[PDB]
Amino acid sequence: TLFGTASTGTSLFSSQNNAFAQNKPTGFGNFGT
Amino acid sequence: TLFGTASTGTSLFSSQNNAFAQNKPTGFGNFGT
Amino acid sequence: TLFGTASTGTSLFSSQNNAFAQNKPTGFGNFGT
Amino acid sequence: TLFGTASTGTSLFSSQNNAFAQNKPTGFGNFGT
Amino acid sequence: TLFGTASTGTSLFSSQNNAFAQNKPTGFGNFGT
Amino acid sequence: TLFGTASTGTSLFSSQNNAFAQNKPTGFGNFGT
Amino acid sequence: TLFGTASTGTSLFSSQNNAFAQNKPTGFGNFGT
Amino acid sequence: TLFGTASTGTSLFSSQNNAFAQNKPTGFGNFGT
Amino acid sequence: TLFGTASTGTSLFSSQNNAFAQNKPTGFGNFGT
Amino acid sequence: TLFGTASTGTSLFSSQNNAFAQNKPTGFGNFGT
Amino acid sequence: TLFGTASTGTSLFSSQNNAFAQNKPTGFGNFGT
């Protein structure tokens, strides 16, 4: 009754977001001007 | 009764978002101007 | 009663989003102006 | 009673979205202006 | 009744955000001008 | 006795190469394996 | 007796190469494996 | 007897190479594995 | 008898290389594994 | 008998290399593993 | 008989290398493992 094990490797500029219960997770937003 | 193990490798500029219960996950949004 | 193991390799600029229960997952959105 | 193992390789600019129960998954949306 | 163990490796400029109950987690926001 | 002003707009994955005297300019070459 | 002003705008992943005298300019080469 | 002014704007992951006399300028080369 | 003024703006992950006399300038080379 | 003034602005992770006489200038090389 | 004035602004993680006579200048090399 669980997620499990989620990994990443050798990744430049990288964001993971881990939860049991996420509401609206996001990838980056706003780079540059 | 679970997700399992989800991995990535050697990926530039990479975002994964892992949950048991996601609502509206997203990839990047807003780069540039 | 599970997903299994979903991986990626050697992928530039890459987002995966993993869940047991996704609602409206998305790929990138908004690059450029 | 499961998905199985779905992988990708050597793919530029690539998004996979993995779930047991997806509602409305999407590929990219909004690049350019 | 848990998440599990989610790790990352050898990742430049990287933010993970881990919770049992996230509301609106985010990746970076605002780089540049 | 000149080229003039050559511009591009809102173009994904784009290379222009500008010169007074080009010899063998090229577009991309080698993507994938 | 000149090139002029060559600009680009809002272009993802973009390389221009500007010279008075180019020999063999190139666009990208080698992405992936 | 000159190039002129060559600019770029709001471009993700971008390389320009400017010279009076270029020999073999290049765009990216080798991303991924 | 000159290049002129070559500028860039609001560009993520960007390399320009400027000279009066370039031999073999290059864009990135080797990201990932 | 000169280059001129070459500038950049608001650029994340950026390398310019300026000379009167360059031999083999380079952009990044080796990120990741 | 000179380069001129080459500047940069508001650039995260940035290396310029300036000379009258460069041999093999380089951008970063070796980040990660």
Author numbering:
A (entry chain D), B (entry chain F), C (entry chain H), D (entry chain J), E (entry chain B), F (entry chain K), ...: 87 to 119
Sentences from the paper on this structure:
Key to these Nup98 activities is its large FG-repeat domain with a high number of FG motifs. The most aggregation-prone segment comprises residues 85–124 (named Nup98FG85). All four fibril types display a parallel in-register β-structure comprising short and kinked β-strands.
To gain insight into the molecular organization of cohesive FG-repeat interactions, Nup98FG85 was allowed to aggregate in pure water. EM revealed the formation of well-defined and mostly separated amyloid fibrils. Using cryo-EM, we determined the structures of four different fibril polymorphs (pm1–pm4). The most common motif shared by the four polymorphs is a 13-residue β-turn/β-arch structure. A leucine-phenylalanine pair (L91-F92) is located at the tip of the β-turn, with both side chains pointing away from the turn. In all four Nup98FG85 fibril structures, side chains stacked along the fibril axes build glutamine and asparagine ladders (top). Most of the stabilizing interactions arise where there are clusters of two to four phenylalanine rings and one or more leucine side chains. We obtained values of approximately −20 kcal mol–1 per chain for the four Nup98FG85 fibril structures.
